[PDB]
Symmetry: D2
Subunit: 316 residues, 4 copies
């Protein structure tokens, strides 16, 4: 029976009225929270022609619900090439990008899946809206995600700190669980698909091996790769290590489309002491030549991400 | 798997951005929705020194949660005599009044209980806030309630129409179930505690008896009184009849404190074709001499409420 | 998370072990609780053939759930034409008469509704086993009702006591929350349909006004009528009064069916030390002759029913 | 609301009726599912003695739940010192070895975790009945695990097949969602802790690189390691690969306890037409000598484990 319910939905407000502007941010977030709820459930009854469906049906969901916080100008889905411009009598200051369900049909192993989202603010005036607003990296206002695992944590990283929230299934609300997360600067785990790329790896090959074979008397870093992008970013935020998905030969390297996958993921890391590096540049400071641009990432604890550029540059 | 989730929390927005002002209304409503959720549950696990508690604990709840939509100037609880003035760096345009749990310890018979709420807008300037804003009747902007019965319907009557919403327990959201409710103008049920007041009744005595003994060849009106104010207003909104609680001898007659009980209840009725009459005046058009003023009500279908003033005035 | 989690099952299983029985009671009740649960969810979101459906679905769900426990052999239902005789393969010794959703279409005004059941034992050799196995008067071995109010309460009565379990939705188990439960001598509220029955009430009139404005002098009775058998009876089990539906035209009076509305409820009332008569015959001692026999009922606290009977003596 | 609601129970109850048994299996599994459910809720909101608590609570909850079914007699647990010998009053014929929360404190990174169990039958006369009743190798009558991921999945294996049920939280019942289930010949992902085991991998090395960059020429393997037995094994039951935790120092190698981690899981794998060896001994044929015996395991698709064995031949 527990009186100080600290919901996302008023927490964002407590820093956001201590700043004026327009609500919008919260109306956006809140609406995103309903759809996330919505997905957590149909996935918790997971599987009670056939090809895909769940996910595309939920991209459906994320859209209108995002398009009804009167707070969006334009959306960019993994599922849709082109930005879908939000309507006149529904537009508001903001631009979002989202992979609505990273893992949609790899559920079968009751593995972790997620909704990654990245929010921008349209601002550059009468243009009117159109796809171009999908242009910076290091300027997303608000970014985070939602892992439906044993639970449904929605981690929300903004402007000034990383917060984790938990779905409380008793009352339909995301509740402040940890207030300002910072990353285990080193001491670690490392994660990569060592089948697929082991032969195909480059400078990073010796990287793994001094992370296996200790150039030392150090005990070694443990392997841990779930194969889902959200599950694996989160276990790096929390217990701390280095996650890396390059994918060598064709090189806007891995599946991870920059802009709604590795870019939320980069800012949420960035705000907790996280380096997010292409290996040559910094993932936040890259302008999107095109909105669906696949582009790699190494992220994690700073003294670990940093040992990897010391690999990469005295090398390539 | 069901894509057009029409939640309260954006519905109010769809008429409210089609009007400008400031969000506030929705932030208030939305926050009220969390606390209502919160109560529905602890009541659904009802009863897993001892005197009362549940309710007072929830008045606790309604307050801060109302005091964190930055949208209140002053609150008036059944549970608190005096308006509690909301804080400086938390005040916003609005005044609320609420019986946070009409029926708190009559639960035992798993009967219906509720949260009645009435919202006003402070407007009358630098005064600063203080208890006086609890002054009209027929000017509440927004009013309705929440019955936790077989379900948890939150019926929200505003300015331009009565809406009913249902708690969907799968996703933590109140969903538009009926869009613009209007009252069965007659054809009826009638409800009063015919024990307690039967001897004590006045003009209204013959009223009941021509509602029992048909001054006719009409079949008679059925008895139906649950003894909870919300359960009984709702069954009158829906199947239609007349509810009446006078309580004759001491006459700000019944327990129902005007201002947060019979006044929400009056506007929600009013907006669906509902007469809400003291029996002499009209319950909405009465100014609160004091904020805890008990004061009676007859409400219901118009050709029935109206047959009761035809009782009352060619009589008293 | 307490681990001495006393589910209905463990209650029912301890008791079948004392009695040295075969385990059918336990699986029957277990089956039945699977339906009570899904029906309790059906209703929590109703409003979100087509003239009437939810009753039927409930009745198919309860026959199905009961046939699968091999533990039953005749099933008598509010809905089916005649008895359902269970296939030799899924048989067992019990006989269940049940109403699947009492008050089924009076559920939008959101009041409590429920499922009622009574369980006989088939004692002759073959027949094979048809509806004549519902002759029995008070030879129930178990009876009870499931109440779908703001919590789902299953009050169960058997040879030793009435016990009250509550559905904890955090785990989907009816938990034992209240024990043995006796009703209290006299202490009242009189629950009756005050309209029509007032145009037909004979000895009941005297009783109504003897309890309205008292002759042994002082303090009057309250009235309360929900309009739903399960509801008006359950309130009567917890608070004290008297309940009556004798209503005259429909002259085996009552809508209340003898096998599956009145006898279970009489049983429970009686096991809790409260009585129930016809005003002439005891309800439980009446033999059946029709399985769809309507029978008049009046029940509740002792003193109170005896008062009505003292009056039915020198009267009509 | 479909009424042929096939719960785990009805599955287990049909099967005990074929086998002409006593009904203990059904109540044991029934008890066990009451804990699987509350544990599944414990975890859905963790984050909302004190160094470690949730494991223990789970283990007390599962012993308690198992003792109440009179159906058990020795209980062996990851946590308790020695066997728990059930009081003569609550006894029955089964023997359960179980781990209550595998991966208990690696649950904030929110990954799947679970409860694993194996069920023996006590076949000697008295003793009275102590831990020696856990000699048996593959003499399980039932084994399975409960997986607490984005849905709670209970995979159960017994004499005839592996079957998969899913917890429907709309009713609190494990429902039968998938049947008989065989694993598929070869088809892979190799799941292994690639770090340390790489510094100790003997024949496994050859195998790792024979499956990294292939010699019979073409298409490589993926790696996947969650770091949780239940999780890495369940994924292996649905998709195809190989799983290995042989790890050398800890030389009855394995953290994986023989009675209640490796033998259940071997059983299930084997019943689904996949194998599990030590690389030397079959896991299921190994006799115990300690109830806390650690044993090395490698398991999963046939071809794949046979490949590893072909190599363990001419090797080390």
């Amino acid at each position: 029976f527990d009186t100080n319910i600290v919901t996302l939905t008023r927490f964002v407000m407590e820093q956001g009225r201590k700043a004026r502007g327009t609500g919008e941010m919260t109306q956006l977030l809140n609406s995103l929270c309903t759809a996330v709820k919505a997905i957590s459930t149909a996935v918790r009854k997971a599987g009670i022609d056939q090809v895909k469906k769940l996910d595309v049906l939920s991209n459906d969901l994320v859209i209108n619900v995002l398009k009804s916080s009167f707070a969006t100008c334009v959306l960019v889905t993994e599922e849709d090439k082109n930005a879908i411009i939000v309507e006149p009598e529904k537009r508001g200051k903001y631009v979002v990008c989202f992979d609505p369900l990273d893992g949609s049909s790899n559920i079968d192993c009751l593995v972790s899946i997620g909704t990654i989202f990245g929010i921008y603010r349209k601002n550059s005036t009468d243009e009117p809206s159109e796809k171009d607003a999908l242009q910076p990296g290091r300027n997303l206002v608000a970014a985070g995600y939602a892992l439906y695992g044993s639970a449904t944590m929605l981690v929300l990283a903004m402007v000034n700190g990383v917060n984790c929230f938990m779905l409380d299934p008793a009352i339909g609300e995301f509740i402040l669980v940890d207030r300002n997360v910072k990353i285990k600067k080193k001491g670690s785990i490392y994660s990569i698909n060592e089948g697929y790329a082991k032969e195909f790896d480059p400078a990073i090959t010796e990287y793994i091996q001094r992370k296996k074979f200790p150039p030392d008397n150090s005990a070694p870093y443990g392997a841990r790769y779930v194969g889902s992008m959200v599950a694996d970013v989160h276990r790096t935020l929390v217990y701390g290590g280095i996650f890396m998905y390059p994918a060598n030969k064709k090189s806007p390297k891995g599946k991870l489309r920059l802009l709604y996958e590795c870019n939320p993921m980069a800012y949420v890391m960035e705000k907790a002491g996280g380096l997010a590096t292409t290996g040559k540049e910094a993932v936040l400071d890259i302008v999107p030549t095109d909105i669906h641009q696949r582009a790699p990432i190494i992220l994690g604890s700073p003294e670990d991400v940093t040992e990897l550029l010391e690999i990469y540059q005295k090398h390539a």
